[PDB]
Design a protein around this ligand. Structure first.
Ligand code: MG
Ligand code: MG
Ligand code: MG
Ligand code: MG
Ligand code: MG
Ligand code: MG
Ligand code: MG
Ligand code: MG
Ligand code: MG
Ligand code: MG
Ligand code: MG
Ligand code: MG
Ligand code: MG
Ligand code: MG
Ligand code: MG
Lengths: 180, 74, 74, 140
RNA sequence: AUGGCAGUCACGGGUAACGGAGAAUUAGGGUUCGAUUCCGGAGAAGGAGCCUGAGAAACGGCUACUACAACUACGGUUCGGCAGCAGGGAAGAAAAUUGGCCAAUCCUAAUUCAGGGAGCCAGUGACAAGAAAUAGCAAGCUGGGAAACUUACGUUUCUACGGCAUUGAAAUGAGAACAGUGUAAAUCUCUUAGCGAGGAACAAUUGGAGGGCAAGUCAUGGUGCCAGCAGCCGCGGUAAUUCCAGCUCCA
């Protein structure tokens, strides 16, 4: 079988398998952003790292350089749409300063919860896995969805599910359809 | 050193000797998945634990037995 | 009800047909059977039913839409 | 000084010098001449064999115990090999003349701990695992 | 005629060596791989030799030998050559179905319409990759904290948050299905009616708690240098933080 689809690796494993400070930080992350499973934080780390390699290579370059101009512009435009970067920092240097804390805060969980759409950072993660939320024109069943600043406007519940005006689910139906 | 019964060098000796003790039947169960790491965060990295003296923070396995869970809750 | 947005329309004299991309909106309902999409399309473009071939439909995730293709022979 | 040429025409002498001194690095040496291929595994990861003998091996000082072992005849090599049998009363899962799967002890060609000179361990008996058997998942 | 090559390594060995495009790691410099999608080269059991062609030393062509495969009425014969696909045997530590089609991609032909184990489709598939359930929200009883006060235990709230073989209804996929999507047909997905959650069930494991290394300050039971652990240091010789187990805890 010949196949030309590309390879991926989303995360990375630490040089040091056990170190307290790191493990503790990672569990503070898992705690606050309501993750499971350390690799989730690792793949976020990976993502950030990519961003930073980009900014670094671009800072190698002359400020006049066409490539730094175009690609730098592209990187920052790319930040705003995700709202990783505030209005005021459009300089490449501020990319490097990116916190995992900011980047996880762009999660769909982090978004749904902090939108008063869910009681708990955990309530959230079921909800968006329960098929209960729409983002933009789609129905997002994925917790790891990085949120478009622009789609933050339309986050509301699925017209499909209850909370969306749709039929009450199998539970309420089975409870209610048994009389007396 | 005059206590000897079994032949030295017999193969399964210590394992055969060991009494069979049955694993306790658990009331309910241990949550799988995310919920477990929630549980861990709670009993470990949660705000109240952090608030306490970091040098006086209590080590995760300190209690094997339940009498010190009774002494811990009081 | 079924709404049909008709999208990309190429007039193809060579094979003497019209080639079509279709967007079906069925917000409350399951994916539309081709009989219905055919009939609604013919209603729109005024042609005969058996002059229209309807093919390759993709309902999206969450179920408001489908995208498909159509052919209308002269 | 430094006993090493620095000069721009000095290239080959530099590189050749390394191509020489490199031989004193052991892993390089063992790699480069086939050493792997001649070893009882013939370079391989594991091997299958037959059990010639069940043998006890008295541990190195300062430990006393009887390490349960087997002498195996490797089916690929027909070389004779002395291999250790792990955990407890697992020497019982072995019958003389069985098929047995054998791997390294983790020192890649060398013995570990108190067992002197024995470089291999037992993994499978007939078809099954020593682990599977020990924990009593399957039966022989 | 007496040259040609050679320490600027000739000639000759070795390669568990086909060469690249590339792959794994990478501060930088390196190290180590590339049988294997693309491009070259080579070969069709081993050697050699041919026919015919525009192109061949063809090998899903022939001739011979060496070593083999299939019939035989023994005299003869084979459209005998899996390093094509599928499948056997063997070797091994090590690798899938003797399946469906030309619908797509393209190729061939006197050719729109025929053929194609190229290719595609399905099966096997913890090689490897991506996303991701294994529960969520409250309640009653408790802990805990924070305040005030009370001078020494009572009150009150909870911008910490916990914990309960205790109660409550909602939420939903795994499962399973009418239909609709999809296909050459079949399967699967996707959309969706009728269905499908309260506890040993719709229950996660695999490895670890002396150090390296996260986790026991079990007055835990067994064994008493035995059985065994231990990559290394070491643990075990009757109070084992190291074995066999139970509880708990860690990754
Ligand atoms: Mg396949
Ligand atoms: Mg070395
Ligand atoms: Mg190792
Ligand atoms: Mg020693
Ligand atoms: Mg177990
Ligand atoms: Mg090479
Ligand atoms: Mg060429
Ligand atoms: Mg084959
Ligand atoms: Mg055809
Ligand atoms: Mg995977
Ligand atoms: Mg169907
Ligand atoms: Mg349940
Ligand atoms: Mg233990
Ligand atoms: Mg152990
Ligand atoms: Mg004891």
């Amino acid at each position: 079988g010949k196949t030309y689809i590309n390879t991926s690796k989303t995360y990375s494993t630490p040089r040091r398998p056990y170190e307290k400070e790191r493990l503790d930080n990672e569990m503070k992350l898992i705690g606050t952003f309501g993750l499971k499973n350390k690799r989730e934080v690792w793949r976020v780390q990976m993502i950030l790292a990519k961003f930073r390699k980009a900014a670094r290579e671009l800072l190698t370059l002359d400020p006049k350089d066409p490539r730094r101009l175009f690609e730098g512009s592209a990187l920052l435009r790319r930040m705003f749409k995700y709202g990783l970067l505030s209005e005021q920092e459009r300089k490449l240097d501020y990319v490097l300063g990116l916190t995992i804390h900011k980047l996880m805060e762009r999660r769909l969980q982090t978004r749904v919860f902090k939108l008063n759409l869910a009681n708990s950072i955990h309530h959230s993660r079921v909800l968006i896995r329960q098929r209960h939320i729409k983002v933009g024109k789609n129905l997002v069943n994925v917790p790891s969805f990085m949120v478009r600043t622009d789609s933050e406007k339309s986050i509301d519940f699925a017209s499909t599910s209850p909370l969306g005006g749709g039929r009450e689910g199998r539970t309420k139906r089975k409870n209610a359809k048994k009389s007396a | 050193m005059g206590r000897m019964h079994g032949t030295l060098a017999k193969a399964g000796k210590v394992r055969k000797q060991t009494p069979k003790v049955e694993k306790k039947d658990k009331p309910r169960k241990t949550p799988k998945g995310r919920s477990y790491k929630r549980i861990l965060y709670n009993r470990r990295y949660a705000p109240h634990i952090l608030a306490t003296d970091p040098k006086k923070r209590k080590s995760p396995n300190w209690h094997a037995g339940k009498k010190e869970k009774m002494d811990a809750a009081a | 009800t079924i709404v049909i947005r008709t999208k990309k329309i190429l007039v193809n004299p060579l094979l003497s047909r019209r080639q079509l991309s279709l967007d079906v909106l069925h917000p409350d309902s399951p994916t539309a059977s081709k009989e219905k999409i055919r009939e609604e399309l013919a209603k729109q473009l005024k042609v005969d039913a058996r002059n229209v071939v309807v093919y390759g439909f993709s309902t999206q995730y969450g179920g408001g839409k489908s995208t498909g293709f159509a052919l209308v022979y002269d | 000084g430094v006993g090493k040429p620095r000069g721009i025409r000095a290239g080959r002498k530099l590189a050749r010098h390394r191509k020489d001194q490199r031989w004193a690095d052991n892993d390089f040496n063992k790699r480069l001449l086939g050493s792997r291929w001649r070893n009882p595994f013939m370079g391989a990861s594991h091997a299958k064999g037959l059990v010639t003998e069940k043998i006890g091996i008295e541990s190195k000082q300062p430990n006393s115990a009887v390490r349960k072992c087997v002498r195996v005849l490797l089916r690929k090599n027909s070389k004779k090999i002395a291999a250790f049998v792990p955990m407890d009363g697992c020497l019982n899962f072995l019958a003389e003349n069985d098929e047995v799967l054998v791997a390294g002890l983790g020192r890649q060609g060398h013995a570990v701990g108190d067992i002197p000179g024995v470089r291999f361990k037992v993994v499978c008996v007939k078809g099954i695992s020593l682990l599977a058997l020990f924990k009593g998942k399957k039966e022989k």
